[model samples]
Target: NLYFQGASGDLYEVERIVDKRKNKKGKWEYLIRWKGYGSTEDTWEPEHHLLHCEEFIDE
Candidate 1:
């Protein structure tokens, strides 16, 4: 469901939620599992950046 564009123009899927926290501006951010990448490659992404995937997100 959740997807993002990589630097190489590839699409990555958000496999699951790993963690969540607030940012400096008080916005929610999340640590997510990127399909095809290992846990070491998981990264934090802003909530706003994932609006398109809201339907797929749990919260």
Candidate 2:
């Protein structure tokens, strides 16, 4: 499990990884499940934004 900071600086744990895809600009993004947040609230964040939480990534 991994925890990440939200835009508001609130800590949110990662429930799981959903998917990966490229954005319109061709940048990699990760589809993630935020703990306590519903499926509808799942979000896609840029890979660079999640680098600080590398322990959760399998490489």
Candidate 3:
């Protein structure tokens, strides 16, 4: 079925990690860009959301 084509169980791909910042609260955040969206959609995601994204965070 066409539903299978929309298989996004737990794999939301990130296009690129743009910027990094440590907020006043001492929490690290990363500017993330979604693969199919525009700059307007690019948002900052907290480090907690990136268990698998440490590969880029370390860079």
Candidate number of the best lDDT: 1
Residue lDDT tens for model 2, 1-59: 56666678776678887898999999998898887787898999877656345445665
Winner on lDDT (1 vs 2): 1
What is candidate 1's lDDT per residue for 1-59, written digit by digit as tens? 78766557666688877899998999998898887778999899877566344445565
Clashing pairs in 1: none
lDDT of 3 by residue, 18-47 (tens): 788998899998887777777899888777
Each model's lDDT comes to 0.77, 0.76, 0.65
User: How many clashes show up per model?
Assistant: 0, 0, 0
lDDT of 3: 0.65
Q: Kindly give the stretch of ten consecutive residues in candidate 3 with the minimal lDDT sum.
A: 1-10
- At residue 41, what lDDT does model 3 achieve? 92
Error of 3 at 53 (Å): 7.3
TM-score for each model: 0.68, 0.63, 0.63
